[PDB]
mmCIF file of C-alpha atoms (C1' of nucleotides) and ligand atoms in Angstrom:
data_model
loop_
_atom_site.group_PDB
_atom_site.id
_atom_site.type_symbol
_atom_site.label_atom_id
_atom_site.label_comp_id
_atom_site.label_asym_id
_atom_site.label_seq_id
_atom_site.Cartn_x
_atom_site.Cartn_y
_atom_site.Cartn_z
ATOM 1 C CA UNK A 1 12.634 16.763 -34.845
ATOM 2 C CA UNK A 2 15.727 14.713 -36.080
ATOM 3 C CA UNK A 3 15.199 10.805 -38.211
ATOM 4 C CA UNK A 4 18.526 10.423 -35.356
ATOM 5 C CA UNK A 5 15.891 10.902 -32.744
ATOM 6 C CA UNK A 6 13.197 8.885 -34.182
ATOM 7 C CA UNK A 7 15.426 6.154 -34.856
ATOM 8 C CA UNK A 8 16.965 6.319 -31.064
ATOM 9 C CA UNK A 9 12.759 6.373 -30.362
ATOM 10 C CA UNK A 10 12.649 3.076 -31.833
ATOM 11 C CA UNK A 11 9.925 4.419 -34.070
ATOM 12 C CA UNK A 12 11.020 2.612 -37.168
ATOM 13 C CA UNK A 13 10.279 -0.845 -35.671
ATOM 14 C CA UNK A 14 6.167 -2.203 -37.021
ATOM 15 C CA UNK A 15 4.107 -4.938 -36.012
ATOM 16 C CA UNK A 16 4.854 -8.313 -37.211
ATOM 17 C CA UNK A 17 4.752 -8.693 -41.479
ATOM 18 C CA UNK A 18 1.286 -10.759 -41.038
ATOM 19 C CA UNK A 19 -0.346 -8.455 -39.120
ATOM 20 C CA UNK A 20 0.053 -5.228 -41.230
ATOM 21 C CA UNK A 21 -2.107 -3.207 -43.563
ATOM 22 C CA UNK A 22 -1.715 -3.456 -47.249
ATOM 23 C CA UNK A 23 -2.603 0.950 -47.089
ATOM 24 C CA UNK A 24 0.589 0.963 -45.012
ATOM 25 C CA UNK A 25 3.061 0.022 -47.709
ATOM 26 C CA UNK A 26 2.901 3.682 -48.903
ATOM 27 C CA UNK A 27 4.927 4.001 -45.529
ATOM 28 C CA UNK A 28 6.817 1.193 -45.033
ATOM 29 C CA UNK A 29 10.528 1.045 -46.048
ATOM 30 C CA UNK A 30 11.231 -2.788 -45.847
ATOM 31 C CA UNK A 31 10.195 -5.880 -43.754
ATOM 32 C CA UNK A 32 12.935 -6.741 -41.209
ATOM 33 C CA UNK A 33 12.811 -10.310 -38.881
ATOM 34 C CA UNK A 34 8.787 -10.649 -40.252
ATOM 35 C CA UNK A 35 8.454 -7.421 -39.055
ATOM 36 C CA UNK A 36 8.057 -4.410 -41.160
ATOM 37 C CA UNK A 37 10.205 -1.184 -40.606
ATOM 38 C CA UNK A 38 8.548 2.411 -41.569
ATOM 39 C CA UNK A 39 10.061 4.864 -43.766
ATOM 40 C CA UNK A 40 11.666 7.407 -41.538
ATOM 41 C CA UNK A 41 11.990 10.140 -44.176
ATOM 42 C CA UNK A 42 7.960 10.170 -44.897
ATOM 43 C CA UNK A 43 7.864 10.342 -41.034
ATOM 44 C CA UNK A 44 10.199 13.364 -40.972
ATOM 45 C CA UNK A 45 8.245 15.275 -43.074
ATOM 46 C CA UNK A 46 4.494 14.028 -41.923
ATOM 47 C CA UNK A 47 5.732 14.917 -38.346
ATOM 48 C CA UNK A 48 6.244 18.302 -39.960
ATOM 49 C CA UNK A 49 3.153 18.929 -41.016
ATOM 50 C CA UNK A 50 1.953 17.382 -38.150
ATOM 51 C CA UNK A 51 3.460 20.345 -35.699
ATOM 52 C CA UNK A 52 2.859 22.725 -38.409
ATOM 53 C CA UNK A 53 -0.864 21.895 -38.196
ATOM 54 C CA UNK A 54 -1.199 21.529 -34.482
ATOM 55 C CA UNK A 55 0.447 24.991 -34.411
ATOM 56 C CA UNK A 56 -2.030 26.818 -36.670
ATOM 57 C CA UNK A 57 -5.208 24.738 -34.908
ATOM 58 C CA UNK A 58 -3.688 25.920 -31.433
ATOM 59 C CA UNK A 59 -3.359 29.959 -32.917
ATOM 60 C CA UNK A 60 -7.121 29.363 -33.904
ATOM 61 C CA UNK A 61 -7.778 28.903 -30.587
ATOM 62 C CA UNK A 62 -9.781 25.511 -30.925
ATOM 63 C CA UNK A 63 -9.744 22.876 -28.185
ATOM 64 C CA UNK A 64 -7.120 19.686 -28.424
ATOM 65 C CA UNK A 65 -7.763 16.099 -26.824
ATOM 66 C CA UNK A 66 -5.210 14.048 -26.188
ATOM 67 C CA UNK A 67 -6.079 10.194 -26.323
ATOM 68 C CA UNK A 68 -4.314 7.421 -25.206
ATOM 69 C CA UNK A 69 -4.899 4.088 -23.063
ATOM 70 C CA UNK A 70 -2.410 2.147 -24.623
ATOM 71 C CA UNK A 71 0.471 1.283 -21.600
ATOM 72 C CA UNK A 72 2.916 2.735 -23.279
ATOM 73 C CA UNK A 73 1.172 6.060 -24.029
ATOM 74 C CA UNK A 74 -1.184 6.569 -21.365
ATOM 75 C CA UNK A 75 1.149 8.547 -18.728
ATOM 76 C CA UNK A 76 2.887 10.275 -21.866
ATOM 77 C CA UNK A 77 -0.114 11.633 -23.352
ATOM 78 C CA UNK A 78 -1.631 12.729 -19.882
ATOM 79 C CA UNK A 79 1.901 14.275 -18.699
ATOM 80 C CA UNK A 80 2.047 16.314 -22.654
ATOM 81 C CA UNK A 81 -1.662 17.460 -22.605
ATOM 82 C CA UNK A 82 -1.483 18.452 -18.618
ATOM 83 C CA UNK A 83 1.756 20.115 -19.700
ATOM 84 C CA UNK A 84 0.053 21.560 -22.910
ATOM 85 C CA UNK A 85 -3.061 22.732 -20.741
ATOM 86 C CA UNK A 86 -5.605 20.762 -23.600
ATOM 87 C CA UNK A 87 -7.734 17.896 -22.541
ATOM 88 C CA UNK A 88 -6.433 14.432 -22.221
ATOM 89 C CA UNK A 89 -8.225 10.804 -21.784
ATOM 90 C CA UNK A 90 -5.903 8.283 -20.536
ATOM 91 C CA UNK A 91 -7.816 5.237 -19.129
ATOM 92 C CA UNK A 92 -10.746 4.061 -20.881
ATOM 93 C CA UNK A 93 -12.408 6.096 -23.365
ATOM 94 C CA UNK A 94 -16.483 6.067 -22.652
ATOM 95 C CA UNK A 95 -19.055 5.340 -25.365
ATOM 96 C CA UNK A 96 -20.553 8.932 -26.206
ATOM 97 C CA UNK A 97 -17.467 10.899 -24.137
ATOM 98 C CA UNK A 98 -18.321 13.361 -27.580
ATOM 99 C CA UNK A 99 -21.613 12.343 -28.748
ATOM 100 C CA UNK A 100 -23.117 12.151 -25.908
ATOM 101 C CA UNK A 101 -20.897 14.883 -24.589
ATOM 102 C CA UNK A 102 -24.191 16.312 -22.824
ATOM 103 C CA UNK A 103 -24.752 13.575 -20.725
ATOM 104 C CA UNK A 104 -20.986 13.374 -19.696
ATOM 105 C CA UNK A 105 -21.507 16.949 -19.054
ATOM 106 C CA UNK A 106 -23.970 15.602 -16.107
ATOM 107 C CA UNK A 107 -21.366 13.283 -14.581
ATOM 108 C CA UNK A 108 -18.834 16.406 -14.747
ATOM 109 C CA UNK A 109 -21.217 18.366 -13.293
ATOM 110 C CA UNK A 110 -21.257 15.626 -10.703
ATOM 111 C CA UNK A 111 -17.402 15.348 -9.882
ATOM 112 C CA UNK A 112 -17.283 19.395 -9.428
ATOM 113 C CA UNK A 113 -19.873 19.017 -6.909
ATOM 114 C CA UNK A 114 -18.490 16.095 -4.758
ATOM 115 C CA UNK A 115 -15.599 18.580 -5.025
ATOM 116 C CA UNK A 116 -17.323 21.593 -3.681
ATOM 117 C CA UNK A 117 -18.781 19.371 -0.444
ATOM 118 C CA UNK A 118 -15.195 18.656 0.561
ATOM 119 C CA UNK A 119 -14.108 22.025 -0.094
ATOM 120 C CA UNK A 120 -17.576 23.266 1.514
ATOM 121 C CA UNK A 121 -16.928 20.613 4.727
ATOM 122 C CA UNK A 122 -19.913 18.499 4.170
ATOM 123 C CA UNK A 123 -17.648 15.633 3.896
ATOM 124 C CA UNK A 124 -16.354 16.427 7.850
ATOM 125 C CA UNK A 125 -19.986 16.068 8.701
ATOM 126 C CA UNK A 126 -20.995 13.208 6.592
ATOM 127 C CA UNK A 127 -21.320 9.865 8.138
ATOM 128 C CA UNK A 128 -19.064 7.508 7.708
ATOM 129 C CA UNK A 129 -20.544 5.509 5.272
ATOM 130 C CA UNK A 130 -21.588 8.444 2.980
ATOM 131 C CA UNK A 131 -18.152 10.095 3.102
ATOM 132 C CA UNK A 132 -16.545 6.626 2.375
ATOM 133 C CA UNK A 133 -18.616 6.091 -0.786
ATOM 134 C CA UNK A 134 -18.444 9.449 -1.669
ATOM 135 C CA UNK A 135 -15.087 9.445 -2.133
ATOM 136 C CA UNK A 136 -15.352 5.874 -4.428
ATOM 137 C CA UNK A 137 -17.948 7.893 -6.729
ATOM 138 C CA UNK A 138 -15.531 10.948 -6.862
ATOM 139 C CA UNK A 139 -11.972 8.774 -7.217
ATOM 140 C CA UNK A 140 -14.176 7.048 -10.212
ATOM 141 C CA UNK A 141 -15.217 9.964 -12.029
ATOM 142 C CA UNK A 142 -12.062 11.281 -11.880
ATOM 143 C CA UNK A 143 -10.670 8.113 -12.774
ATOM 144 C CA UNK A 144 -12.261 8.313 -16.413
ATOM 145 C CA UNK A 145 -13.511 11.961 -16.661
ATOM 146 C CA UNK A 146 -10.618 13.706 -14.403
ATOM 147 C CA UNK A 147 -8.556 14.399 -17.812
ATOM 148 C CA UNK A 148 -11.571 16.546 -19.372
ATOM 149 C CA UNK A 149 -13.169 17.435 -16.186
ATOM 150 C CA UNK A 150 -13.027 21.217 -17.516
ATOM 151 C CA UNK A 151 -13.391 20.616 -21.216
ATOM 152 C CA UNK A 152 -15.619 24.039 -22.240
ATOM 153 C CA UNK A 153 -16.766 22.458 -25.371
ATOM 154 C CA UNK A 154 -16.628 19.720 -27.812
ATOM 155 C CA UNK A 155 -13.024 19.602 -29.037
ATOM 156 C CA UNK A 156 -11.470 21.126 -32.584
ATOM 157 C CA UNK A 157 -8.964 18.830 -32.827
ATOM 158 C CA UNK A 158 -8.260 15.290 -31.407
ATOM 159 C CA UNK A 159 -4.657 13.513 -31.155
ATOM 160 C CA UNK A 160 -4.397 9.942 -30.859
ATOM 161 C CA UNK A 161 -2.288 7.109 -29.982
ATOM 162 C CA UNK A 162 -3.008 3.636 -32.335
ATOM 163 C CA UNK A 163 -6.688 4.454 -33.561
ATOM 164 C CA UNK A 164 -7.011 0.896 -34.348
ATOM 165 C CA UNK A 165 -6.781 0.472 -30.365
ATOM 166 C CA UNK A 166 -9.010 3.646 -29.682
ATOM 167 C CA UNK A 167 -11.821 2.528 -32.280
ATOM 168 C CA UNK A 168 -14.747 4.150 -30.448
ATOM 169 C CA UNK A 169 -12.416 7.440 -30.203
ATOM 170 C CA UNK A 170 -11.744 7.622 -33.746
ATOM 171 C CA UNK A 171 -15.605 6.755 -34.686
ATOM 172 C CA UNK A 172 -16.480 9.385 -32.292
ATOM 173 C CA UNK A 173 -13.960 12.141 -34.115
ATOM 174 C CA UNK A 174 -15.547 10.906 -37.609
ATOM 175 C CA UNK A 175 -19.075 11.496 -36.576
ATOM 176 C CA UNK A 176 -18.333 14.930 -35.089
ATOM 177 C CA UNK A 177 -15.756 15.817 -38.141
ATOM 178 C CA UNK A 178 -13.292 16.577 -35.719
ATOM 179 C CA UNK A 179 -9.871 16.283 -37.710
ATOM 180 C CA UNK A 180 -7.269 13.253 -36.691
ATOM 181 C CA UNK A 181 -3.786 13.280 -36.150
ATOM 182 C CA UNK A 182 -2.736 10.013 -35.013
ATOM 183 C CA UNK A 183 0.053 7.873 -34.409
ATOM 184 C CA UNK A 184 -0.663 5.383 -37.277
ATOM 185 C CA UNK A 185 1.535 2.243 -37.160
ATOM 186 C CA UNK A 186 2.031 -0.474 -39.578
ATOM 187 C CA UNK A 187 -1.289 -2.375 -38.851
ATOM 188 C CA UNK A 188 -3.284 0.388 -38.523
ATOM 189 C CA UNK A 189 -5.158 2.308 -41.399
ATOM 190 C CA UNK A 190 -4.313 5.586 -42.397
ATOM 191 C CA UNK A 191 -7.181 6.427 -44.714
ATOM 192 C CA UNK A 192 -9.471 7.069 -41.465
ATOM 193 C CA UNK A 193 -6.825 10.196 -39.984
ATOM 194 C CA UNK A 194 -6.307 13.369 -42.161
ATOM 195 C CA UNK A 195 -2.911 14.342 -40.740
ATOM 196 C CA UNK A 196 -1.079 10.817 -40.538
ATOM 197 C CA UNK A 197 1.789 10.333 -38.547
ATOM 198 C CA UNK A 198 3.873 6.900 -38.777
ATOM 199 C CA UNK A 199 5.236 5.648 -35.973
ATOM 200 C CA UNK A 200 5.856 2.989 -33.897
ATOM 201 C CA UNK A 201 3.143 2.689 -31.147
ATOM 202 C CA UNK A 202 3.977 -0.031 -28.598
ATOM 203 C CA UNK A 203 7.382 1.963 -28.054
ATOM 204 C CA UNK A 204 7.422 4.238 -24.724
ATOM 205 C CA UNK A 205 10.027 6.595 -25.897
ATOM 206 C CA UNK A 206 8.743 7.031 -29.599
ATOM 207 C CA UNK A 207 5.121 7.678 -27.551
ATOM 208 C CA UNK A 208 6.540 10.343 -25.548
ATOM 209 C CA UNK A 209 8.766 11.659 -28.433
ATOM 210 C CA UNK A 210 5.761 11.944 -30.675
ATOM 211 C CA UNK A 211 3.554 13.280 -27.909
ATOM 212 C CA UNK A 212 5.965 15.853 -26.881
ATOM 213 C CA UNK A 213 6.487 17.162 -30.680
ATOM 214 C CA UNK A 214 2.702 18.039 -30.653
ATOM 215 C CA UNK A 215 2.049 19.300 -27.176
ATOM 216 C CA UNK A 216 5.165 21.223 -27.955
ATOM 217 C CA UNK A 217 2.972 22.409 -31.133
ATOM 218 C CA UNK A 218 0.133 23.265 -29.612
ATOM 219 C CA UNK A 219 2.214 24.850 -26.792
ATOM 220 C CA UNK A 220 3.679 27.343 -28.970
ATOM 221 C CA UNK A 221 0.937 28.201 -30.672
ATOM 222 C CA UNK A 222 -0.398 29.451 -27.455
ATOM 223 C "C1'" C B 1 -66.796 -9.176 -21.882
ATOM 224 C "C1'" A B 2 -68.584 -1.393 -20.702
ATOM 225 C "C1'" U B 3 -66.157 0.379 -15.728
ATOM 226 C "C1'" G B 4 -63.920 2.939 -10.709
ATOM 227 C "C1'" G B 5 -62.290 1.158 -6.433
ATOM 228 C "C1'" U B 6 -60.707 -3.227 -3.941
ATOM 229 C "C1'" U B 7 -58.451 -8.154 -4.275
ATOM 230 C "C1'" G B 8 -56.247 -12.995 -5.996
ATOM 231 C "C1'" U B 9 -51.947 -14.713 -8.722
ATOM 232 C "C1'" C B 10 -46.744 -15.646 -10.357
ATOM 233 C "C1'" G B 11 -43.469 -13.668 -5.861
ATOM 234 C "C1'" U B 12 -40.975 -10.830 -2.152
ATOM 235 C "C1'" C B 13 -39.169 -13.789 -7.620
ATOM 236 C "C1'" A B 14 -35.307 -9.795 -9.105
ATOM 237 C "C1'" G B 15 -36.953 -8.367 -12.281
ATOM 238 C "C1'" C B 16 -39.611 -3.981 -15.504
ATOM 239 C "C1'" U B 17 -38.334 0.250 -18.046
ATOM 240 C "C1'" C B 18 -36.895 5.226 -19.878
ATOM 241 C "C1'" G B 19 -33.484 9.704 -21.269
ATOM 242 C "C1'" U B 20 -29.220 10.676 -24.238
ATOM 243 C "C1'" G B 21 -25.771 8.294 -27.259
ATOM 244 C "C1'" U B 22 -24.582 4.376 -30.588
ATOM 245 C "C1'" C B 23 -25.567 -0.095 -33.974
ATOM 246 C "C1'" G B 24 -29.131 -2.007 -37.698
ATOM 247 C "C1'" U B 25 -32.230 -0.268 -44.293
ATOM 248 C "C1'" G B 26 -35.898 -2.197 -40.830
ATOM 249 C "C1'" A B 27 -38.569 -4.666 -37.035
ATOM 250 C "C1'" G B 28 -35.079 -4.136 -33.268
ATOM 251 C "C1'" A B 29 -30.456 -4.099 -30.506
ATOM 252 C "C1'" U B 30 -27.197 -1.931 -26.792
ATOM 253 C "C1'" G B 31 -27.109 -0.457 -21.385
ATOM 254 C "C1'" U B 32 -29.927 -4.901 -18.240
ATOM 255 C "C1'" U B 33 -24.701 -8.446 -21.535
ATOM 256 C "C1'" G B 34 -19.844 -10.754 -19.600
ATOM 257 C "C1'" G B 35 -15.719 -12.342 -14.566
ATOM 258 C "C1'" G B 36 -16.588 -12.244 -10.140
ATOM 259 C "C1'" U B 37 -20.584 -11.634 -5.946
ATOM 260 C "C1'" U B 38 -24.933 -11.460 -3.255
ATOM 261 C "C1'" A B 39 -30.954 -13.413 -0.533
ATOM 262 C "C1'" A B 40 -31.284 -9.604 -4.266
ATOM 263 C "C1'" G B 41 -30.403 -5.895 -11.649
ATOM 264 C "C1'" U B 42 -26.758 -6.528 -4.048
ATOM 265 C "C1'" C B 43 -22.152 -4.866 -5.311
ATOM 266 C "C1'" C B 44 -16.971 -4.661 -7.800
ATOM 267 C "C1'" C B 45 -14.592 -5.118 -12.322
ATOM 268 C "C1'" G B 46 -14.693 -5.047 -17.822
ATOM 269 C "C1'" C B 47 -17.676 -3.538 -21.689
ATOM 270 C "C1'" A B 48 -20.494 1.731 -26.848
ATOM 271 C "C1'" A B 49 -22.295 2.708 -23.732
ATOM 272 C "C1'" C B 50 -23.363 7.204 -19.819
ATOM 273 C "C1'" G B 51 -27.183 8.054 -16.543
ATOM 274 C "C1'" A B 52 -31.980 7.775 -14.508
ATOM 275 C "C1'" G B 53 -36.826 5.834 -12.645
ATOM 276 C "C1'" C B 54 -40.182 1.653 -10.691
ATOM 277 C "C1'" G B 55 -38.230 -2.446 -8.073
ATOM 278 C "C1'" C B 56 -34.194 -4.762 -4.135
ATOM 279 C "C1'" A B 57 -31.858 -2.825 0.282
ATOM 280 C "C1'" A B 58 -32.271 0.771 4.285
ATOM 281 C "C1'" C B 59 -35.865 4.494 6.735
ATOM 282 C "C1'" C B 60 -40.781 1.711 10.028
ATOM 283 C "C1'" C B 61 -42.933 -2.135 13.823
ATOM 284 C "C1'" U B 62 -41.675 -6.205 17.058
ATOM 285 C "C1'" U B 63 -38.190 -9.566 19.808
ATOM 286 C "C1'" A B 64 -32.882 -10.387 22.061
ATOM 287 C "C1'" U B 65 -28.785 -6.553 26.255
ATOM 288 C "C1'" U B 66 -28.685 -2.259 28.667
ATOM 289 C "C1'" G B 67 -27.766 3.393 30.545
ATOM 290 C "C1'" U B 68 -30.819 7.116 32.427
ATOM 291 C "C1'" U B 69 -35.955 9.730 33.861
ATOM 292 C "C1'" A B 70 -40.048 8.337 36.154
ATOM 293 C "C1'" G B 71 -41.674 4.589 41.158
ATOM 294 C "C1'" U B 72 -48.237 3.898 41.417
ATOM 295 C "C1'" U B 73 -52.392 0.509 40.705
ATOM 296 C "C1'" G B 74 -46.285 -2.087 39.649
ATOM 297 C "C1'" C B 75 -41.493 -4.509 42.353
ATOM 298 C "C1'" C B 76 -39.524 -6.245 47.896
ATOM 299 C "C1'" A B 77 -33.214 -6.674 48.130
ATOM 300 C "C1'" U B 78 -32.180 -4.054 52.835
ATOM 301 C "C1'" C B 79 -35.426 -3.492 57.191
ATOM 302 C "C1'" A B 80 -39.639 -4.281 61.377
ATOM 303 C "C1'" U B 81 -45.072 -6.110 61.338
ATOM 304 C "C1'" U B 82 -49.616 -8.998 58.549
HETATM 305 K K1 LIG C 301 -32.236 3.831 -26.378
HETATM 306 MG MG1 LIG C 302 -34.370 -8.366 -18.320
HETATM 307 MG MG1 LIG C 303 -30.515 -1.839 -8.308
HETATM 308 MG MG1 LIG C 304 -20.789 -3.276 -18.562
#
RNA sequence: CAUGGUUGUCGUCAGCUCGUGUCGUGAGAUGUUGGGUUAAGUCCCGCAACGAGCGCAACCCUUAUUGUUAGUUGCCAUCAUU
């Protein structure tokens, strides 16, 4: 990646000056219109290591989720995982998706079978009313467990876009010690991610810039 | 005022709970809360909650129309007689 790309990407651009993190000024470059602008050079190289480590947890062969609801990142990290082949959450993230990944493994379990009666032609035969609320169940779980429908296991690695809007998703990765690397903007906090990346995150470009960097990581290491 | 069974009661009110997860040092909490909505915890949406069970609802009986099968002990329109 190119600081001429980022900076195209709008990724420079922060949150406004009162709404920042003091742990962020290790990042920040200077405060523009009360609004503080990150330092493109430490995003250069943490975008780096960002790839370099998405590569190397891709060659292990570990499992990536992508997370996003934010607006601006939900399509982009959905298309970038899909197109990746890893895991992606891009509506609403449920309490216990991880820690209580066994009892999400019961509503998965749930959406292949709705599945299989369509497939099977129960759903011809159904009556009406079952077939129509069938469907509702099914577009649901879909809705908010379609992106991991086929998740084998609990992931090894989890990306994310603004932890500070995906608390639960970042709580989740800390509890499971599955390592971070996140899209960390100016009021977010960095100490909670191990591989930081600082960029802008109510930008749709610099989303899908950032999010294509690391499915492109994880891509090649496959 | 040792009990089984049976029954009254709130009330046919929409409530009562559990599994896993999570929060809290802990008793506990969460879900069951909230915006809507319903007769209903009925249902949609949102939500660190995801589900599930007893409930509610429906399955049951009866009444309101009617197709057909049956046509005596029932009915009499068409018919002729009492
Ligand atoms: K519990
Ligand atoms: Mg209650
Ligand atoms: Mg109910
Ligand atoms: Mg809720």
């Amino acid at each position: 990646i190119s600081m001429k790309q980022l900076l195209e990407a709008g990724v420079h651009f922060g949150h406004q000056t009162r709404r920042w993190n003091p742990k962020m000024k290790k990042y920040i470059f200077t405060e523009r219109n009360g609004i503080y602008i990150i330092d493109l050079q430490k995003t250069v190289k943490l975008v780096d290591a960002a790839y370099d480590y998405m590569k190397n947890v891709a060659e292990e062969g570990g499992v990536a989720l992508f997370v996003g609801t934010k607006k601006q990142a939900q399509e982009a990290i959905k298309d970038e995982a899909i197109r990746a082949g890893q895991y992606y959450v891009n509506h609403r993230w449920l309490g216990g998706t991880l820690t209580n990944w066994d009892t999400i493994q019961k509503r998965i379990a749930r959406l292949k079978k709705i599945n299989a009666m369509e497939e099977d032609g129960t759903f011809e035969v159904l009556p009406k009313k079952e077939v129509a609320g069938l469907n509702k169940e099914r577009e649901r779980l879909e809705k908010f467990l379609g992106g991991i429908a086929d998740m084998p296991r609990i992931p090894d690695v989890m990306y994310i876009v603004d932890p500070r809007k995906e608390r639960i998703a970042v709580q989740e990765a800390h509890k499971l010690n599955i390592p971070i690397v996140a899209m960390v903007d100016t009021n977010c906090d960095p100490d909670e991610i191990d591989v930081v990346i600082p960029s802008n995150d109510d930008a749709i470009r610099a989303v899908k810039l950032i999010t294509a960097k690391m499915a492109d990581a994880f891509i090649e290491g496959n």
